[model samples]
Target: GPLGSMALRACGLIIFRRCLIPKVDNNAIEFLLLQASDGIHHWTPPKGHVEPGEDDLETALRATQEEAGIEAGQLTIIEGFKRELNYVARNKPKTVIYWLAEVKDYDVEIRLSHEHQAYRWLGLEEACQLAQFKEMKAALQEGHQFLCSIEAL
Candidate 1:
């Protein structure tokens, strides 16, 4: 067989519930960051490997819902943009993709699973510092700048 397998692919979302009504018109966004319970116990947005019968979009929803305990319908995918990140996990190349989505309601309950322990609502600087991964940092920075760039003043 020539082209046998592909990189380990995972999908997720840059989820945040933030202020809009008043529209502060700045980068006052707070992303939901969760700490993993395994390996290095690193912090990251909700994510998981793509399932066999699922698409990237499907994987995103499932991964977010499973790790963060948030349902599919509860999220609004950001202005239609996604990032394909490249990295290595488990000693193999990993392609982790993510999209930005905002939670519509305030005080919405967000539960965690055994996969994650501590969690926080963090801004770009804080989230990047905690994540400390190149691809992930780019994802957040890219995602943040994209939305901020949108809806120009």
Candidate 2:
């Protein structure tokens, strides 16, 4: 028997906010990025592994709250903008799904847990630069495109 274990699955939200008072273009949208407390101090949106008996969306909400202190009630998940990214980490296949969510309060405080040491609110371009990973950058780009389309409607 040579059956391997299942691939790791994670879920999270791509949380963003439109500036209360817009000055520049791009709808003044800004994304939330958190710096990990460990492991190269990588920056990413709030995310974590799926717990037993928890659905993907539930994991996304729970992870967002745990990692960024943003509760499910504080964000409105945007419909029609979900992304799934597949990659390898630590020699294991990993899948991360992200749903677009809009932060209700643009100035909401971010309370990081031990998992994260720092956080930042960055515009789309800067966020892409910071995210580094190809899939993560694509997710942000797709999310920004989705927002842009909505603004057109």
Q: Per-residue lDDT of 81-137 in model 1, one digit per residue for the tens?
A: 789787767687777788887776656567777889867788788889888987778
Top-lDDT candidate index? 2
Q: Please, what are the lDDT tens digits per residue for candidate 2 over residues 41-129?
A: 87788887875578887788888888888877988777778887878888877778888777788888687788889998887788888
lDDT of each: 0.77, 0.82
| Shift of residue 48 alpha carbon in model 2, Å | 1.6
Off by over 4 Å in 1: 1-3, 21-26
Off by over 4 Å in 2: 1-5, 151-153
Name the Cα RMSD for model 2. Answer: 2.2
Clash pairs of candidate 2? Answer: none
lDDT of model number 2: 0.82
